[PDB]
Design a protein around this ligand. Sequence first.
Ligand SMILES: [Mg+2]
Ligand SMILES: [Mg+2]
Ligand SMILES: [Mg+2]
Ligand SMILES: [Mg+2]
Ligand SMILES: [Mg+2]
Ligand SMILES: [Mg+2]
Ligand SMILES: [Mg+2]
Ligand SMILES: [Mg+2]
Ligand SMILES: [Mg+2]
Ligand SMILES: [Mg+2]
Ligand SMILES: [Mg+2]
Ligand SMILES: [Mg+2]
Ligand SMILES: [Mg+2]
Ligand SMILES: [Mg+2]
Ligand SMILES: [Mg+2]
Ligand SMILES: [Mg+2]
Ligand SMILES: [Mg+2]
Ligand SMILES: [Mg+2]
Ligand SMILES: [Mg+2]
Ligand SMILES: [Mg+2]
Ligand SMILES: [Mg+2]
Ligand SMILES: [Mg+2]
Ligand code: NA
Ligand code: NA
Ligand code: NA
Ligand code: NA
Ligand code: NA
Ligand code: NA
Ligand code: NA
Ligand code: NA
Ligand code: NA
Length: 546
Amino acid sequence: IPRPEYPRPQFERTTWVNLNGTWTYEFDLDDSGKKRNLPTAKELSKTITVPFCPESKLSGVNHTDFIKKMWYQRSLPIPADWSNKKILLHFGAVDYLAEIYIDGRLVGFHNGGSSPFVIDISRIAKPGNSHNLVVSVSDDAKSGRQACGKQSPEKNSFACFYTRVTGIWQTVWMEALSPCGLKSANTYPDIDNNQLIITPEFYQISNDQTLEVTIYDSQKKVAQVTSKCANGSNLILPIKNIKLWSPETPHLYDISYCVKDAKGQIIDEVKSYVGMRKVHIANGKFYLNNEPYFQRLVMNQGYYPDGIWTAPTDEALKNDILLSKEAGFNGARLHQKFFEERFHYWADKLGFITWGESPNWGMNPDDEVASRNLLSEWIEILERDRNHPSIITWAPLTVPLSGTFARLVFDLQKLTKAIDPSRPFNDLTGSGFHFLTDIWSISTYEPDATRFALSLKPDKNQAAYANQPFIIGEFGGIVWEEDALFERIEKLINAIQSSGIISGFCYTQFSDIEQEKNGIYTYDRQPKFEMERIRSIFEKIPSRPI
Ligand SMILES: [Mg+2]
Ligand SMILES: [Mg+2]
Ligand SMILES: [Mg+2]
Ligand SMILES: [Mg+2]
Ligand SMILES: [Mg+2]
Ligand SMILES: [Mg+2]
Ligand SMILES: [Mg+2]
Ligand SMILES: [Mg+2]
Ligand SMILES: [Mg+2]
Ligand SMILES: [Mg+2]
Ligand SMILES: [Mg+2]
Ligand SMILES: [Mg+2]
Ligand SMILES: [Mg+2]
Ligand SMILES: [Mg+2]
Ligand SMILES: [Mg+2]
Ligand SMILES: [Mg+2]
Ligand SMILES: [Mg+2]
Ligand SMILES: [Mg+2]
Ligand SMILES: [Mg+2]
Ligand SMILES: [Mg+2]
Ligand SMILES: [Mg+2]
Ligand SMILES: [Mg+2]
Ligand code: NA
Ligand code: NA
Ligand code: NA
Ligand code: NA
Ligand code: NA
Ligand code: NA
Ligand code: NA
Ligand code: NA
Ligand code: NA
């Protein structure tokens, strides 16, 4: 079974099934599948390896041309000892519109090709029996309604656009739990008050139901509290001598969640973790844990030669972060894609700061329906990723290459502040223009290093300018297939270093991708250059100044 690992490792139960592996599929050229009763089909015409999209080699299908409509199918065995449980069916992502059938009946649907969804099958699922699961998939970027990221709008890859991703591109899985279990737990690290706040949510709360929370440093229990179950009520976990999370020291505390019925019997157990860290802007600087922090970022566009949007293995996700740090970067912009959850896990574990962004390219910037679609995907991703210490900035919009766009800029700023005030917000990347931002990013690919140094200033005449930390969001981009190359990159880093007013940078980019040969690494993650040299250049500006 491919990608067998637990797909939600910051909220982990043991009672799950991985549904990756061999499914059946069909392309539906004339959109006739419903006429041909595909929802009651027990086997479709061909086979595919989920969770790899059909454009991928790892799917075994390798069909890169446009796929407008397709169908997936497999048998869904429900384990016998899931008796009388709540049973959830989870899809990480399906591009773009998914309609879910069980035993031929429509049980759910999801609009948004990059965001997770869940179907409560508690009422339909018959433990110790097998159902027929059929998934209908639509994908039509030409509509202008879809957030596509870097997926090519042309048949072939060209310029900065790459291979498409249709259908199921993340792990499909099921879990069973108490009807009265823990739906979620938001973690709020508060380093100024030496404590962790937890806000729980339960599916249902019975007679005298309690939740017990224990915090661990390794095996050492450092905090514990019990409470009577109430949605949205605060549990306070005091932590003396907090071990702070940073890229340089990625310390995590373990959490156990224990839900008990009126008899003190355990009905639900969940495992989690947290990184005790604080991020805020003040006085023109960016602060990690109440001290300045210099961001040494590389642009990561999250493409893999054999899996396209899908990492071939857990190891390939982890390895992108290790290769990023070996090049001297302390973090990445996660660009034009919602990354897989386990990527944020390895960023949490290995020590790596990230910007969470969106695949906003490929939407018609005059279509309010495109705006409507991105707002809901964005909410789903904030819900999915809000507990990750590695994410230290949200940046949901890159300018594309008519106030609908300006309206969406302000709506995402207000929505994101309301959902998550813990992280700085960057309203707009890829230009020098801002509407309302915590972060003053600019983009400069000026090849001449004298002209480059002079481009290194914010436009303070813009109404939005309010002494925000100044970040070079995009620079470099040097195309390659040596000493000459190293000089060029070193000249840019020294100009940034000499500036005295810059809070961080992001180098374009981590790896080559198809025709774009502007990575530090090849597309198959091989060094292009003497790594000792690369690292000594990109590491020159320290994480912690002076
Ligand atoms: Mg997995
Ligand atoms: Mg589970
Ligand atoms: Mg894939
Ligand atoms: Mg999926
Ligand atoms: Mg989806
Ligand atoms: Mg069915
Ligand atoms: Mg579109
Ligand atoms: Mg969308
Ligand atoms: Mg596509
Ligand atoms: Mg697939
Ligand atoms: Mg690969
Ligand atoms: Mg995995
Ligand atoms: Mg995406
Ligand atoms: Mg991350
Ligand atoms: Mg959209
Ligand atoms: Mg930032
Ligand atoms: Mg943005
Ligand atoms: Mg709009
Ligand atoms: Mg950008
Ligand atoms: Mg901009
Ligand atoms: Mg960049
Ligand atoms: Mg190299
Ligand atoms: Na996964
Ligand atoms: Na889900
Ligand atoms: Na979907
Ligand atoms: Na993309
Ligand atoms: Na982006
Ligand atoms: Na994001
Ligand atoms: Na974006
Ligand atoms: Na962005
Ligand atoms: Na915005």
